[PDB]
Amino acid sequence: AVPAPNQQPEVFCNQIFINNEWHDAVSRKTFPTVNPSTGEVICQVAEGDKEDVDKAVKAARAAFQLGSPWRRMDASHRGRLLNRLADLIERDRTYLAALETLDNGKPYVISYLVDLDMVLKCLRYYAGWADKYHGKTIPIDGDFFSYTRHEPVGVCGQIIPWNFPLLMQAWKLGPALATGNVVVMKVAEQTPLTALYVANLIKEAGFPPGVVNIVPGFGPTAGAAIASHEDVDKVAFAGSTEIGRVIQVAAGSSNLKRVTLELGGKSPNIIMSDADMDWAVEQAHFALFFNQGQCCCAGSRTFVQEDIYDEFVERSVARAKSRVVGNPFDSKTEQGPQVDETQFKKILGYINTGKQEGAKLLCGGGIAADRGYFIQPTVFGDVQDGMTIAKEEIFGPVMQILKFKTIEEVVGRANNSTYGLAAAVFTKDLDKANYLSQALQAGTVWVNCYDVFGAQSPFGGYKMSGSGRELGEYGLQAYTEVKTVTVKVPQKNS
Amino acid sequence: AVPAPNQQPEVFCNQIFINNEWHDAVSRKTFPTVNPSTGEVICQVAEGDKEDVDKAVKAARAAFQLGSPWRRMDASHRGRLLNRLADLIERDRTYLAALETLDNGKPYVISYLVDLDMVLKCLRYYAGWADKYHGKTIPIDGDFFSYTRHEPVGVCGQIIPWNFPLLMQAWKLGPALATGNVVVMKVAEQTPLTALYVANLIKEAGFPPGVVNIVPGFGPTAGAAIASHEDVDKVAFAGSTEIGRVIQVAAGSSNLKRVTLELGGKSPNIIMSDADMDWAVEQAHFALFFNQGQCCCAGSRTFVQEDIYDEFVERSVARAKSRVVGNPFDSKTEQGPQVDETQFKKILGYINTGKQEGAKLLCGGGIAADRGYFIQPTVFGDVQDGMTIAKEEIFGPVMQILKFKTIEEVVGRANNSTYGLAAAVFTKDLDKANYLSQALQAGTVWVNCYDVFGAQSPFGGYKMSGSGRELGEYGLQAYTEVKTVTVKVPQKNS
Amino acid sequence: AVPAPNQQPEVFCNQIFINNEWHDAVSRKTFPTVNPSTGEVICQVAEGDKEDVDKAVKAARAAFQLGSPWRRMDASHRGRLLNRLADLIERDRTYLAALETLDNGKPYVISYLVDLDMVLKCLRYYAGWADKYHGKTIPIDGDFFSYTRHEPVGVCGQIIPWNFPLLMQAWKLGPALATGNVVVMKVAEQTPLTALYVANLIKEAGFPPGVVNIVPGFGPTAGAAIASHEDVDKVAFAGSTEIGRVIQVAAGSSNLKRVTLELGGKSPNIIMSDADMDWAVEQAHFALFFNQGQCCCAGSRTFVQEDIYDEFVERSVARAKSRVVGNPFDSKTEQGPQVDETQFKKILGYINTGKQEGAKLLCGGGIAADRGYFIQPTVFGDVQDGMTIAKEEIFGPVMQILKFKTIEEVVGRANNSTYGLAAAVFTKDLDKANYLSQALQAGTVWVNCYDVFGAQSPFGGYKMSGSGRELGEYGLQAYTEVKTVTVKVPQKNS
Amino acid sequence: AVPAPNQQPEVFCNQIFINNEWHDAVSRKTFPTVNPSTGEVICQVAEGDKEDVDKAVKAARAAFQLGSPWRRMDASHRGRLLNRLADLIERDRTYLAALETLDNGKPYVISYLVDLDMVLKCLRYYAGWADKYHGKTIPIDGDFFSYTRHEPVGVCGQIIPWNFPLLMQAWKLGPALATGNVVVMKVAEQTPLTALYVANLIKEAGFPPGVVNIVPGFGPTAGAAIASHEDVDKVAFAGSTEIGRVIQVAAGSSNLKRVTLELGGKSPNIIMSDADMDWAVEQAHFALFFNQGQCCCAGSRTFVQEDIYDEFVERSVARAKSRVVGNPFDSKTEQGPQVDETQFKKILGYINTGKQEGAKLLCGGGIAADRGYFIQPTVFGDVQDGMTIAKEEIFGPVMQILKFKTIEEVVGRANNSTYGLAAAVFTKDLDKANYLSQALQAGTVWVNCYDVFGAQSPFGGYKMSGSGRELGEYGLQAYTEVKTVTVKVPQKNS
Ligand code: NA
Ligand code: NA
Ligand code: NA
Ligand code: NA
């Protein structure tokens, strides 16, 4: 059951959060954040720049000093703090869900039942890791005792995108805080508000000042300042493959900080002839259209075996046409607006290219409302591998359906991409499932499902979809610095 | 390629092995070992008893003392020694395979290509573990540094059966020596010879004296003396469920040693109607008949879905009839003799039992040869769950085929056993495979295969089929004693 | 900050707990539990026997059936339920701490700040393990996919002692429930009450019926019934070594259930001449006297280097004489009564034996109050290795001080014991600490501290002190049954 | 025992190694490699450039194709190939040790007993990892089976320095090959020869063509081509912090390949007043002077507590003055020449700067021979933190001794560096040892020892000394790509 929303939630936090206190930008500049359902300004937000990043980094470094409350704190207590944060988020779940919808556009029902649920599960999962990520005692040759300490990497710059504002904040804060790091986080200008409210809850939960610092602002300013900072030890970035490059170059051009990246994809969703048709159609719809199509791993190349192609397309068109686009606070709404005007225009551009290059437009193809950034659920059939809409990540409600004949053929075509974030296989056959999951060059392969995220299982890209993994035990690796201590002993024995 | 065998290999080792030297029993007693293909005595072997076990245990304890060569040796060097032993066994592979066949009865081609190959793979795999089984550094609360050492358990008594003499020796020595334990091993009276030859290779490889001690002799004497010994730290026993019960009592009545057990089975092999018929028929044949049916995990309840039952049975009977029983040194032979007269009689008893209780005798059922202990490949059809041949381990070439209708039914029937060693499922369907593999209460579930052992994957029983696991990383757990060291420090920091 | 206690708390739960309901014993018999501070009856408790244990086992087996709520529950949700239970115990902390003191005798301030704190930390620790104890995927030879599932062992019998009633319950429930097992728990007849109240909170927390069942009663009856039960898969026992044998023999005589034991100790605390004197005197006092001396790992052989012996003894005697024995609800009380009349008389007997065998009585030596089971803190000097008080676990406020000269001497003397639960070393020297912690044959070695338990670090005995480990990741191993699934694939690639 | 060297070993391999064949450069250009002891040319070596790197990458890519011999090979068999490679290197040990000395300058006795020993131990260690680096089965929420595959990263570019030519080749090939990767290796122009002979041994050992390809040539050409290559998945670079930046920029500017870096150090070696003097002096000498001072982790800031400074310095100067500099083939020689003229001049320039900036020149300071690149062991006293010789990595036989008062003071001064590769502490005190090992910001902290490497224990930098770890289980992480497979199942149970 979904509690009724406040469709116009008050904003309480709209500044820079450093040392558990709220700050205007050094410059006093602010930027508007807009409600994409209406195109209207929600509020002004402090416009952080390099000087604000510098204040944040110094606060973080101070909190990380040997002997500080955060460094001395029992690991188990970091877990308690994470669990307390989750409880406060749960207390404020309807507010956060409404604010998320207001600022991002996703349906409130989904904000409440999905994003907020996943946030809680992520924070709670990582809370349990805080005191369990052991180093090693090692049977080295000779008269020595050798062991490893798993220490925190240090001051962690985290730049997060607008598509799942709260969930991405949690995917970043969970592992970083579980491992004893400190954070300078840059949130998306499209969706700064929910992360800043969470900062208030971080303070309420009792995290020492400077442990989490949040700097709203723009990428070429605030994000760049983080990536290039001489006292930031590690940077994590999620966004486009384009800005990804800028990050890795800045790390190399500054202090050789450690880098992980989560970038785009053009993920293949492969429907074999023996798939359960009803399930495959529904899941392929979800795979593409979930979150207004704004998902890093959207199943944006739907490959369908020729024998079932005609029926699959027919069912897929019927399902896209039934999808309800509208006010994301309305319980019936399945699809909200796209996040902002830039994305709106980009998607319309991709739709135009699909028409121009001769993909068969089967439904949708245009704007879905006279106000707000709403786009009709759009399906192109008879898509070919060389088409722009088969190659580039659209990040909107635009489905590509491609026909194939053999399992060998589809592997090659699926893997013929510079991306490799995710893939899926729909089939009843044991051998086909195993053949495909091994052969597909992707970070996650879903079998008879899609977008199944568990805090327990890692996620991240092959190839130019990024590097490193988030979630699960793996998500702790980028947040750990390993120290070997090797001690002379009188006489080593087994 | 299989090198031509020496059909009358010379015997070089037939005494008690302690401190890298050969000894008679204190009593001077010897016992004959028999060639089961001919029923003739091969040679006499020293008959170890309590006093000889006591000498072995003292030697092992001495080798385990702090500061000893074996205790001080680098972990990596334990690996070098295991690798050296493997190389010596490989040097002597053709001889060992022939001796194995001579004393045990299994076909020489199989001793050569299967048993010896697996021995080499097992030792080489565990050589790799010797310096990699790390303890942990642990982020305990308060101002402490806490860590664990993985130490050897100490003096390990190992009692091994006659079905796979060399391979079972390797399964036991591999992990015990990788982890720096010392061993007192009791080999089967039916098949002492190959293990004793391997003792010469242990000395040759360079193992310090007292690290491995081997005492041939009988169960209620030498085996019991190990189990009950007040200075044995750990016992590993493989054999009948009946004797397994004795060992745990003897252990708890002595010094509370740590015990692992590898016992019998009545493992279900489930053939779904969508299975590959030709593959399932061949695999079900192998699953039962492998090694003269003398396999702990033999597929001795072959459940076949009713729609394919008739065809399956026809094919299975033709395959049993075609199976060549004969001189295990003849390359055409698929089945050698049973290991001894006691087993021979027991199997004839079970064949008569099946006849008496109304199972349909479809082929075989009698003695296959004049000399030795040869039994015809025997297939019973229309076997019912309450039949003795459906419940008790026969340990011979006697196949039970049962009919079932539904997947739900067969789970219940398969699991209705006090055994739980292995199980298998033959199906092309992904959901059926996952359903059954989860539902079956067995230590190993094979899917579209049978008897697939890898040194890398653990093996052992649920229920009264055993406890603990052999092989893989898991096989090291029973051979490690864990010590926590917790040290006050001036100020703990993450 | 310790809340004011209810010095005569009411009792709400005093029956058998099965399927989340309270039951009288089938026999309708009850037994009294006594307040050791006064020797008066608190209340009657249901006296469970074999029939009651049978009801509990059947309930647990039902809760463990494939497809049941507890079996289908997400691993993360098992975590949630453990966390909820912890929260409820924290809600009722003041009450439970007072009840613990009422039934056990330990000081309220200690029940509140130590026991309850450790109970919460243990449950919260294992809550975090619920969804993190991964199986493996394994690069087996050949065209196969092989992996392991870590499954629950099943129905777990858990028999817990009276020394830390609430903490020992938590040490048992945490790992068992985190791993999805079900439990039949037998609590000590001396201290049944707090565990029964906790059962009420298990129901309140939302654990499915049958997941935890508690049968209070007597050892030769209910305990034996659990250990011998044909449908109990695993047994964990903590108590005396005598019953340890009983338990392992029963298990070998019944169904081959998996067994773990935590038994006595006579743990050595070694004070080197270079120790911090004041710290070593205070910690040696704590190591022996903690919990009325009723600790499995009490430092009951205090070895002191000859050069500092006289001063250490002088200071230790002064400290023992200053230790306040009294009503455990009085804030000034450091030592409460012994748990019951049996222990009270047994300890007095050992004091008499010490006096008669020529140990030097330096202080204490008799009863400390006319009512309740109070014993004076007692210190024996010039204790020798062969003395009864140097060999047998007293489990009372009776300190043994032994003189030694050299580090090799103390190692050998410390290790010359059939026990090996714990040991400690007080020294400022790096090499001495390392030499000793390696050389000491004990499950836990403390360096410049004593009785430092974290949920994070494993604990358990060498030799006759027990087998298996509790706490840490290691605490999960005894509660896991490992299944290997090995699947034929079209073509294995790396 | 050290076999007599051939002081003029024949060169057999001097070309580009691709597909197990030898190739001239496309350009047909060659470059000379020089003997640093004489300044004379040994032989010409193929000058690989971008076009040759391209050929190597294509060969490696083909070798990595799904279904290839290398991709299909059992993991255990990769292990066998690594062990076979080690056997071959052992067979040719005396030759390789001499050739290493000829091309690099290090003493033959060291090449033989240290470098070759370590190479063998590294390869044999990683051989054991081949079939043991498991992925996970994961208890994700919902009706799913989730697991991870540990797959190879793919085509790995490996750029290795001249200081430990064979050992660095082994450190890179061991983990890459153990995990099933393919390699394009660029070796240092100063020391190409031994790596090329090993390539001949890789062929001999039976590695499939293309699995290891070696391109000799210059940095700005061949090295750059690797770092910038669009079909290289992963680059590992060891060398100066200067070139480390270029690598990371190249990766970000090309295809976002994965990057690990092993870079410079200025490692602090801290001698507390309570240290064993003779030991600390000898170990500090080794720490700095080992390998002609050409070690990433040289103890090039020797901090000595004021109370022992004068004595330590006197003893240090005596040891430096008696260190034998000469022909590296003479068994008496402790120090050979520097690797080349560039280094020779750079080091002399640092010595001049040291004198100019006011450090006290205690011994050495100049050229040690009239031919070859020999420099006198040089000791500077009264070094201050702000001096150039205290800040910049010299990479030669130049020792810096600094005085300090307190342990708190020395932590700050030690950590006040942009480097963090290693550090050491000499003390008899347990608490000072644990204090310092925790506080020091370095990848390896040695205690009462220095330069203790073991294949089992990881090594790598903090801060600008690099990122990622080599050796140990950790060395496998950078060579692994993690894939999650998440499978819908009928009903998930524990
Ligand atoms: Na917005
Ligand atoms: Na025989
Ligand atoms: Na009581
Ligand atoms: Na050279």
B345's tokens: 């009689």
Burial of B54 (0-12, 13-18, 19+ CB in 10 A): middle
B11's tokens: 């015997």
3-state SS assignment for residue D306: helix
Q: Which residues of chain A are within 8 Å of residue D456 when distances are taken between CB atoms?
A: 138-141, 146
* Candidates B47, B100, B189, B262; catalytic one: B262
Q: Which residues of chain D are within 8 Å of residue B76 when distances are taken between CB atoms?
A: 121, 124-125, 455-456
Burial of B38 (0-12, 13-18, 19+ CB in 10 A): middle
Closest of A328, A366, A480 to residue A8, by C-alpha: A328
Active site (annotated) includes residue D311: no
Mark yes or no for CB contact B486/C457 under 8 Å: yes
In C, minimum Cα distance to D135 occurs at: C137
- Judge if B205 and B56 occupy the same domain: yes
**Amino acid letter, B47:** E
Measured between CB atoms, which of C446, C460, C486 is closest to B449? Answer: C486
Give me the phi and psi of A419, to 5 degrees please.
-95, 160
Distance CA C196, CA C187 (A): 9
Which residue positions of B form the known binding site? Answer: 239-244
Residue-number span of the structural domain to which C94 is assigned: 1-264+455-494
Gap from CA of B190 to ligand 2 centroid (Å): 4
Distance CA A451, CA B347 (A): 56
- Judge if C122 and C221 occupy the same domain: yes
Active site (annotated) includes residue D156: no
Q: Which residues of chain D are within 8 Å of residue B493 when distances are taken between CB atoms?
A: 438-439
Distance CA D56, CA C245 (A): 67
Q: Mind telling me how many Å the CA of A88 is from chain B's nearest CA?
A: 25
- Judge if C271 and C399 occupy the same domain: yes
Could you say which DSSP state residue C369 is in? -
Could you say which DSSP state residue C113 is in? I
CA D365, distance to chain mean position in Å, is 27
Q: Which residues of chain D are within 8 Å of residue A454 when distances are taken between CB atoms?
A: 138, 140-142, 144, 146, 486
Q: Which ligand is located closest to the Cα atom of residue D343?
A: 4
Q: List the catalytic residues of C.
A: 262, 296
Cβ-Cβ contacts under 8 Å between B and C: the total is 181
C174's tokens: 């945490």
What Å resolution does this PDB entry report?
A: 1.7
Closest of D226, D230, D252 to residue D239, by C-alpha: D226
Mark yes or no for CB contact B256/C244 under 8 Å: yes
Mark yes or no for CB contact C447/B487 under 8 Å: yes
- The strand pair at D360-363 and D378-381 is best described as antiparallel
Angle ∠(D122,D124,D127) on CA atoms, nearest 5: 110
- Judge if C318 and C413 occupy the same domain: yes
Measured between CB atoms, which of C437, C472, C487 is closest to B138? Answer: C472
Q: Which residues of chain A are within 8 Å of residue B427 when distances are taken between CB atoms?
A: 430
In D, minimum Cα distance to B146 occurs at: D434
Q: Which of C454, C469, C485 is the last residue of a domain?
A: C454
Q: CA separation (Å) from A327 to A34, A107, A363?
A: 15, 8, 21
Mark yes or no for CB contact B473/D132 under 8 Å: yes
Closest of B369, B450, B14, B4 to residue B217, by C-alpha: B14
Distance CA A24, CA A47 (A): 8
Residue D177 CB partners (closer than 8 Å, separation 6+): D78, D81, D82, D126, D183, D207, D211, D212
- The strand pair at B30-35 and B40-46 is best described as antiparallel
- Judge if A350 and A442 occupy the same domain: yes
3-state SS assignment for residue C133: coil
Mark yes or no for CB contact B136/A137 under 8 Å: yes
Domain CATH code at residue B390: 3.40.309.10
CB A438 within 8 A of CB D150: no
Q: Which residues of chain D are within 8 Å of residue A144 when distances are taken between CB atoms?
A: 449, 452, 454
**Amino acid letter, C146:** S
Q: Mind telling me how many Å the CA of C361 is from chain D's nearest CA?
A: 35
Could you say which DSSP state residue D370 is in? S
Q: Which ligand is located closest to the Cα atom of residue C106?
A: 3
Gap from CA of B459 to ligand 2 centroid (Å): 26
Q: Which residue of B119, B124, B432, B440 is the best one to mutate when testing the D interface, meaning the one whose CB has the most D CBs within 10 A? A: B124
Closest of A7, A82, A2, A3 to residue A336, by C-alpha: A7
Closest of D308, D265, D315, D306 to residue D461, by C-alpha: D265
3-state SS assignment for residue B485: strand
- Judge if B333 and B468 occupy the same domain: no
B91: left (phi over 0), alpha (psi -120 to 50) or beta: alpha
Distance CA B427, CA A127 (A): 41
Q: Mind telling me how many Å the CA of B148 is from chain C's nearest CA?
A: 8
- Judge if D403 and D460 occupy the same domain: no
Q: Which ligand is located closest to the Cα atom of residue D194?
A: 4
Mark yes or no for CB contact A472/D439 under 8 Å: no
C111 is an annotated ligand-binding site residue: no
Helices (H) and strands (E) in chain B, counts: 16, 20
Mark yes or no for CB contact A76/C132 under 8 Å: no
Mark yes or no for CB contact B129/D128 under 8 Å: yes
- Axis-axis angle for helices B165-178, B116-129 (nearest 10): 10
D241 is an annotated ligand-binding site residue: yes
Q: Mind telling me how many Å the CA of B445 is from chain C's nearest CA?
A: 5
Assign 3-class secondary structure to D87-127.
HHHHHCHHHHHHHHHHHHCCCHHHHHHHHHHHHHHHHHHHH
- Judge if A255 and A279 occupy the same domain: no
Dihedral over Cα of A317, A318, A319, A320: its sign: positive
D244 is an annotated ligand-binding site residue: yes
- Judge if D29 and D76 occupy the same domain: yes
Burial readout B241-261 (b: 16 or more C-beta within 10 A, e: otherwise): bebbbbbbbbbbebbbbbbbb
CB D207 within 8 A of CB D69: no
Give me the phi and psi of B12, to 5 degrees please.
-115, -25
- Axis-axis angle for helices C165-178, C93-104 (nearest 10): 120
Q: Which residues of chain D are within 8 Å of residue C147 when distances are taken between CB atoms?
A: 137, 147
Give me the phi and psi of A138, to 5 degrees please.
-125, 130
Measured between CB atoms, which of D149, D256, D488 is closest to A449? Answer: D488
Domain total of chain A? 2
- Judge if C48 and C19 occupy the same domain: yes
- Judge if C492 and C351 occupy the same domain: no
Q: Which residues fall inside 5 Å of ion ligand 2, going by CB?
A: B 33-34, 103, 190
Q: Mind telling me how many Å the CA of D434 is from chain C's nearest CA?
A: 9
Could you say which DSSP state residue C163 is in? S
Burial of C50 (0-12, 13-18, 19+ CB in 10 A): middle
In A, minimum Cα distance to C132 occurs at: A456
Assign 3-class secondary structure to D169-186.
HHHHHHHHHHCCCEEEEE
Give me the phi and psi of D185, to 5 degrees please.
-110, 135
Q: Which residues of chain D are within 8 Å of residue B455 when distances are taken between CB atoms?
A: 76, 131
Mark yes or no for CB contact D456/A252 under 8 Å: no
Mark yes or no for CB contact C135/D137 under 8 Å: yes
In A, minimum Cα distance to D141 occurs at: A454
Closest of C322, C320, C270 to residue C293, by C-alpha: C320
Gap from CA of B328 to ligand 2 centroid (Å): 13
3-state SS assignment for residue B12: coil
Give me the phi and psi of A157, to 5 degrees please.
-85, 130
Domain CATH code at residue A30: 3.40.605.10
CB A457 within 8 A of CB B458: no
CB D304 within 8 A of CB D315: no
- Judge if A258 and A274 occupy the same domain: no
Assign 3-class secondary structure to chain A.
CCCCCCCCCCCCCCCEEECCEEECCCCCCEEEEEECCCCEEEEEEECECHHHHHHHHHHHHHHCCCCCHHHHCCHHHHHHHHHHHHHHHHHCHHHHHHHHHHHHCCCHHHHHHHHHHHHHHHHHHHHHHCCCCCEEEECCCCCEEEEEEEEECCEEEEECCCCCHHHHHHHHHHHHHHCCCEEEEECCCCCCHHHHHHHHHHHHHCCCCCCEEECCECHHHHHHHHHCCCCCCEEEEECCHHHHHHHHHHHHHCCCCEEEEECCCCCEEEECCCCCHHHHHHHHHHHHHHHHHCCCCCCCEEEEEHHHHHHHHHHHHHHHHHCCECCCCCCCCCECCCCCHHHHHHHHHHHHHHHHCCCEEEECCCECCCCCCCECCEEEECCCCCCHHHHCCCCCCEEEEEEECCHHHHHHHHHCCCCCCEEEEECCEHHHHHHHHHHCCCCEEEECCCCCCCCCCCECCCHHHEECCECCHHHHHHHEEEEEEEEECCCCCC
C107's tokens: 């000081």
